[PDB]
Amino acid sequence: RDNIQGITKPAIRRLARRGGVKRISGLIYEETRGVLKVFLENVIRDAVTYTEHAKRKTVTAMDVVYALKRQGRTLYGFGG
Amino acid sequence: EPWKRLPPPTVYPVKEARFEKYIPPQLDGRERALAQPPGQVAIVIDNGSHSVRAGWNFEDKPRLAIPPIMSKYRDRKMGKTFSFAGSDCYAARSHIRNAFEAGTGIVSNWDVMEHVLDYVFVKLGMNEDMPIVMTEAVANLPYSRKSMSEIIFECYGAPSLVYGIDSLFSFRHNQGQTGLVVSSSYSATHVIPVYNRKALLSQAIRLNWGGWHMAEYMLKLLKLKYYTGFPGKLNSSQTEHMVRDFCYVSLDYDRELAGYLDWTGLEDRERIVQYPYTEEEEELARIAERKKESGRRLQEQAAKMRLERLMKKEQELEYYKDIQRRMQGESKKEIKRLLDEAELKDEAALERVIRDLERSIKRARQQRLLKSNWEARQRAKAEKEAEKARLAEEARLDEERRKNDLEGWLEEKRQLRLAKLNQLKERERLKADLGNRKSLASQIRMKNIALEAAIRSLENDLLRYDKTFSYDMTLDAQRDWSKSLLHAFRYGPRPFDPSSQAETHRVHLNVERIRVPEVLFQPAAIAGVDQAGLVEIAGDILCQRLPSLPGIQDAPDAFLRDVFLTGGNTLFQNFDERLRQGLMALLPVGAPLRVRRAQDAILDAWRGAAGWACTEEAKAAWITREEYLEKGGEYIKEHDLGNA
Amino acid sequence: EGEVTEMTPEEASTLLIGLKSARGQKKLRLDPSIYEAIQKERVQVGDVIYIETNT
Amino acid sequence: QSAQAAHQALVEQLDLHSIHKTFRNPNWRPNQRRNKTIKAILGESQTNIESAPSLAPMKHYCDVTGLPAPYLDPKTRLRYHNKEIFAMIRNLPQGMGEQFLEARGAHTV
C-alpha cells in the first residue's frame, strides 16, 4: 500500500515554498517522507490511547488535539 | 591469573620517513662517465612513485634513491626562498608536493617532476650531453610522455631518451625469457605475459592496488580501531612502515582469521607499536580529614533523618492504631468514615502502610521529651535486634539445610539465581522499555483517569559451596573486559588503563597483520576495490587469454613455467606460496607451475635498465633530439621492454 | 572427487565435465549413461561431486 | 643558540634554490596549464583499459573487527561479527557509521 508515496514531490515542494526554500535537492523528497511518517505515527499512537481509554472505536479531533498538546505542539481551532 | 602469567609486552617504536644525511654531489661518477668508451654511457632513471632511482648505466647500483617530492616555501622572516626536492624535504615545515597523482603510476605535477630531475642531475655532478634511460608506467598516457620528453629535450637538452617498463627491465635482469611477470609496486599491481622476451602488453592487466593503497588502508583501519581518539598523530608514512614490518600474506586466510582474536596466544599474534609519550602527605591527611568529616556528617544527616522518621512514623502508627481502635469500637457504619481519617478504606489497606511504617522503623519537663526521644531510639533498637535475630534464625536453618540437604540446597540457589536472573532481565528489559518513548507514561496514566545483591549473594554461595559453579557463570564475569572481544581487538590480553601515558599512545595491530595484504587477493570483499583478485587475474591470463592467442605456442605451459614476482610490494611473507597454491588449483593437474622471486626486487628493475641501456637493441630504440623536434614527444620506438 | 568447474554437453549424447580440487583440475569425457546419472542427481557447476569411473 | 644556527646552516646546505643550474635552459618556459589530472587527460584524449572486474561471489567480513560476518545490520548497513559488535555499532556516534562504510568504499547515500 505504501501511501507515504502519495505525498508527491510537488506537495513537498509547496511545503518548502511556504517554508521559504529556493532550491531543493532531489534527495529531499525521500527524506521528507521519512520525517512526515515518523511524526504522524507518534501523534496517531497517542490519539488512539485517548480513543480507547474513552472506550471508543472512533478517534476524535479532541483525541488528536490532546495528543498534540501532550507532544508540546498545541493546535488551536479544532477545540478547547 | 590469565594475564599475570604473561611477560611484559614487546613493543616497537613508530618509524617514519625522515631526513638522514646530506648527499654531496658525486663528481666521481661524472668523471668516469667521460672516461668510459664512446656511446656506452647513459643516465638511468627509474621513475618509482615511491622512489626515483638514478645513476650510471656502467654501475651496478644507483647513485640516488629519492622520493619524488618537492617543498618550496618563502621563509617570511628571512626573505629568501627555499626549495627542497627529495629527502631534503624532511620526509621541517613540510610544504611537500609530489610529482605523481596519488595512487597512480603517472606523473602529473610537472613542476615537481622538473624539480626532482633538477635534483638528480645536480647530484650526479652535471656540469653541462648524456643519454637518458627513463622507466615508464605500463600503458602510460601519451600526454604524460609528451610532457616528460618535452622537459628532457627543451629544458635539459639531453641528446637522446628511451622509455621502458620497470617490471620488464627487472625480468630481463633475472634471465627472463618467457613467463608471466607479476609486479606489485607503490602505484599498482600488474600481470604481464612475456613471450620470447617480448611483453604481450595487449594481454596485460592492472589491479589498481599497491603499496600506497596498503598504507592508506592500514591508516583508515587504525583510525577506525581507535575512533574514540588515538592521542598520537597517525600518519600514512607511519602505516607504510607498519605494513612493511608486520604484515604478511595468510596461507589460508579464513581459517587463520576466524581464530585470530581468540584469547589464548593473542600476545603472540599481536604486535604493539609505541607512539612517543611523556609522563610525569599533609594534604593526604587533610583530604582524609575532609573525607572523614563529610562522610560522618552525611551519616549524621541520615541518622537524623531516620531518627526523625522513627518518631514520626511510630506516632503515625499509633495514629493509625487509634483510628483502628475507634473504628473497632464505634458502630460498623463508622468503619469506612473512621478509617478515612487514615485516608484508607479498610484495614486491608491500612495494614499495608502500617507495615511499611513498621518496616521503615524496623529498617531504621523536657526530660520527659528526651526520654520519649530516647524511647524512639530504643524501640528501633529492639526492632533492629529482632531483625538481626530473625536473620540469624534464617541463617541457622539455612546452615542445617545446606549441611543436610546440600544438593537440594544448592539446587534451590541455582533456581533462585535463575529466577533472580529472569527478574533482573525483566527489570533490565523494563528499564529498556521505561523511557523508550516518553508518552508511554502519559498514555497509560489516562487508563486510570479516564536484585543485584541477591544475585551476587546467590553467586557467592554457589562459588563457596557449589563446586560445579564457577566464576565464569557470574554476571560479573559476563561483564568483565576479559570476556570482551573488543578489548582483545584494541588492547590484547593485558588489562588496559587510560591513566598510563605509555599504554595509551600505542596501537595494537591484530587482524590487520593479515587483513591488509589480502586486499590483493580479495579486493572487493576487504576494501571494495571491485576488481578481480591477483590469482583470478593471473588465472584469467594463463587459462583464458594465452591459449586463445593465435601466434603463441606451448601456452600455458611455456608461460606457466615462470611466474615472476617483481616490485617491493611483493616482498610479503608467503606471497609466492599463496600465489602458487592459488594458481595450482586453476591449472591442469601436475602442470609445471613455478613461482619465482626476483633478486633484490626493488633495485633489480633499475639494474635491468642499466644493463640494457647501451645494447644495440636499446640504441635502436633511442630517440634523438632531432627526431623529437620532428616527431614530437608522444612518438616512441616500440621495443620488447616498452609500450606500444 | 572435485568441484564441478565445467559441464559441457558435447553432442545432441556425450558430456564433458571439468572437476577441480585444491591441487589441480581435470576434464572427463562422460558416456550418456554416466551423464544422465550425473544429471539425475542435481549436479550443477559449483557443486562438489564424487564419481567412480569404472562402476 | 647553536641549535638554531646549526639548523639554519643545514637548510642552506640542503637548499636547491641557492644553486644555479647550468644545464637548465632559461629560454623554454612551460605552459602554466600543463599540470592536468588523469581524468582531465583521459577526458581530453577522448591504454588504461587494463583494469578487470570479477564475477565470483565475495566473502562477508565484519566492518569493525574484520572477522567474518554472518550478519548485515538492516539499519546502519554495517556488517558485523556478533552481538557484542552489534551493540557497539548501534551505539556509535552518528558520524562514525559512514566511516566504517567508507573504509571499504561504501556509503549510505
Ligand SMILES: Nc1ncnc2c1ncn2[C@@H]1O[C@H](COP(=O)(O)OP(=O)(O)OP(=O)(O)O)[C@@H](O)[C@H]1O
Ligand atoms: N620488505 C618489504 N615488504 C613489503 N613491502 C615493502 C618492502 N620493502 C618495500 N616495500 C613497499 O614496496 C613499495 C615500493 O614498491 P616499488 O619500489 O616496486 O615501487 P616504485 O618503483 O617506487 O613505484 P611504481 O613503479 O609503482 O611507480 C612501497 O610501498 C614500500 O613500502
Ligand SMILES: [Mg+2]
Ligand atoms: Mg616501480
